[model samples]
Target chain A: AMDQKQFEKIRAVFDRSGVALTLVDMSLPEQPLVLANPPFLRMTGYTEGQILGFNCRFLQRGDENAQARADIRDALKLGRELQVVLRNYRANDEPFDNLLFLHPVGGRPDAPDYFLGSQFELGRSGNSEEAAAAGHAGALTGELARIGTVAARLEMDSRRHLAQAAAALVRAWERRG
Target chain B: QKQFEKIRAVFDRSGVALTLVDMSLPEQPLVLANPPFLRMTGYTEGQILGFNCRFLQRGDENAQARADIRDALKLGRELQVVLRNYRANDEPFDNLLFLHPVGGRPDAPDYFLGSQFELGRSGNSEEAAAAGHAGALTGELARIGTVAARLEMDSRRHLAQAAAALVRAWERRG
Candidate 1:
């Protein structure tokens, strides 16, 4: 079993993580963000004071999909997990794809007591804007750079993600019908 | 050696996060995980390997996807499902997992390769096609970035094209 201090060590590593990390306590009514790391703050350009105690939707800035919001709400209501890519704005009003992944954590046997949330931008895969504009972002570049080169393989992964996204769109259609 | 390198290369870098569960071992423990896997899961290789992939699910034991995975593994069949996954820092991610038996068919395969990605989280096409549904078919027809937008319209442009294939098939009677 991990003790408090030991867990903090894990938390420390995430602080240094290039990828953005956020944690929320869904047990509460507001489901406010209880923890937001530096990288996430840096990416969103929001300070703790401005964001704390508020739903992450504050970043939506009136630009979002009702279907996507409904999906996320369903996940939260079920206390399960879900992912959505919303047109989230930064503190400076610069828009970016905030691919949010929200799940339940820290409970025993059954449901978790807390909700865990994390976000990452997979929108800048290449040094050039063309590749980036093409929708390939360095989703795992920070982690990949540490492991070494595998751009060729990532191309395959990118292809697969596109396929999955297409399939998901189809399913969403089925539900709509 | 070149093709061997191909499989070897997948272990090294496929952007799709991968976890290799070694089935030849005492227990079906994770033997390998790519950097992408490590990053996405928020755990070092040390913390992950030698453990069942259930650790990925972390706290939720009642997840419907888990039961699906259990059924798939029992039947030894390949499966694709989305999961409620948590990161090292107790964070969450929606993992779309593609499970396959490594080294040929399921018969005594050495490993289970789990290729995964976060839903609606990685693709650029989401910008063009964020939230589309069947109900929106008419609106999509009117909209530029329809469900078929950012997709290969030549293949499945609209429901009528979808109908054309079926109607043409019946008319041909071939």
Candidate 2:
């Protein structure tokens, strides 16, 4: 488990980022959010009170994109990085397509203490899904690549490169599009 | 070596020739250089550190690139340019310089990150010989610039992380 200093520093990193980001405490029940940045709160239209300590599943109303959720579940269970797009509802019960890029961070191999999630909104009212996904994929890829670079700098104890995962996600999403 | 374990791990692991130049200093001298940078320039750490990046240019003629770099450095913005530079052995190469500002505000970077890539076909340097097809090099560099932009976006945050640690370590070393 990361100490308070490490957690706060990483949280500060997320805070400075323009990307909608959250830090999910894997040790907690249901993996609730410990830190959700302003961009994420703005993106989901949720207050910090409504988001902190709450499971992200609250955003899903029904069995929409069950496969994607399953993929997320599987990746979480295995402590692996996963990127998927699923339907999510906002505070007003409005549906939006969410491109979630999740990565395991800080712990023993295959047993991460936390998960860093970047949220990119897709299917924004009449916008081309392909265009939105592509643009978000680029940003997601860049974010993942940044983490990979930092992991390299720190000689982070993790399996597989985050940049490689970023590339894999781009290719997979491109093929789907 | 023990003092530099973390920074070394990063510098040694990365494929990009990376350099960290201290902006607060008077001359903006290079404070840290990775192994890949040494390999690319054929210069040892002692030879590279504490010198302005113009050392790589070795007085080569690249007025436009120099001016653009100066402008970006003054404004604390990111810029990419291909410069005429020479190696330690005096072999000329087209250096693709991607200038990245790490830490601090956009207008006030704490440090400058330089990622250098050597381009091809530096054998011909004369104006008359190069004038015939300089357009091709521009397009080629532009394509590489696009890829580099993505890379800069991807690696910058992490680079800043590394830079923070490195700056702290350097202060202790001094």
Candidate 3:
């Protein structure tokens, strides 16, 4: 179990950085069980108490949104590192983009331990502009956009590689024929 | 439930082609949960029955799908979608799948059920083809910038390692 002092130390890092952070303790009995962090509450529009004892699973809006939940379960069960992007709702029911980074934290015989640190926002809007103007004044505004562009490009490249590889194999087969 | 058994039977009898893997272990360590549907893929039982699930997945599809599955599992929810599955013969099949928890207990093995059926001749092969072209373009783009390319590579490698770790944890639980 994390003590108050330890939790405070972790919280202080986020506070100083001015980045919203949520610490989800996977060891908790239920989903979305909050360990401690004011930024998480502020970002999610939830009260500290309301988030306690609940599993993060509630963040899924519907049956169609269960993919993230299923992925998380598989990662946790298999003790693997996992990351993903999904839409999460705030206490007020407003949705935001959630980038979750999760990994195993500790080893306890009775409990499988894990830690989830997440950064949330509305979405990857305006990230490119932010990146292009990153060093300029108010440049951080476009950082997300820059990252988003890179992400898009990366995905496109992956697709192209697959196609080319497939085509190459096909060409070789045709030659054989 | 009868519905569950009936669903299972449909998979059992359909010439639709399928790969049933026991994703309960690290390697996504597979066991031939069932392969009555393998005929559609041109692979024999001896060829794939006990092989790792990753072996059947070709190219980036495996990594991409694995990433999506990991995310859903961490959040403890069901994931339903269509994915491109490559067979032992390297033929591509589109599978609509639903993965979820059967029992409330997290320790109980989770299962994935899906099937492959051919869309009519009017099927949009063009879209899949176009996607392949776009993927090639992006690969060239990634190699354009040194830092960008390096970061992208590292990110994917890290994700794969993380996935392996998550699988190891599950196997330890059992």
Residue lDDT tens for model 1, B1-174: 443345546566444466777666766788778776787777788777798887767666437777877687656666656576788787876665656555544566556667664544534433212111111122212121212322322212232122223222323433
lDDT of 2 by residue, A101-176 (tens): 7888777679888888877665341322332233333333333434442343422111113322333443455466
C-alpha DockQ for predicted model 1: 0.03
Q: Which ten residues in a row have the lowest lDDT in candidate 3 chain B?
A: B137-146
In the range B41-157, model 2's lDDT, one tens digit per residue, is 899998778989898876648898799999998898776666778889998876666676655666687777776645443222111111111211121222223224233322333
Docking class of 3: incorrect
Deviating ranges (above 4 Å) for candidate 1: A1-10, A126-177, B1-174
TM-score of decoy 3: 0.34
Best by TM-score: 2
1 or 3, greater by TM-score: 1
Native-to-model Cα distance after best TM-score fit, residue B145 in candidate 3, in Å: 33
For model 3, the superposed segments whose C-alpha errors exceed 4 Å read A2-8, A108-112, A122-124, A127-177, B1-174
Q: Model 3, range B61-126, lDDT digits (tens) per residue? A: 545557777776555554433455676667776543334333224554344333232221112232
| CAPRI band for model 2 | incorrect
Query: Given candidate 1, what's the lDDT at residue A146?
Result: 26
Which residue pairs clash within candidate 2? Answer: none
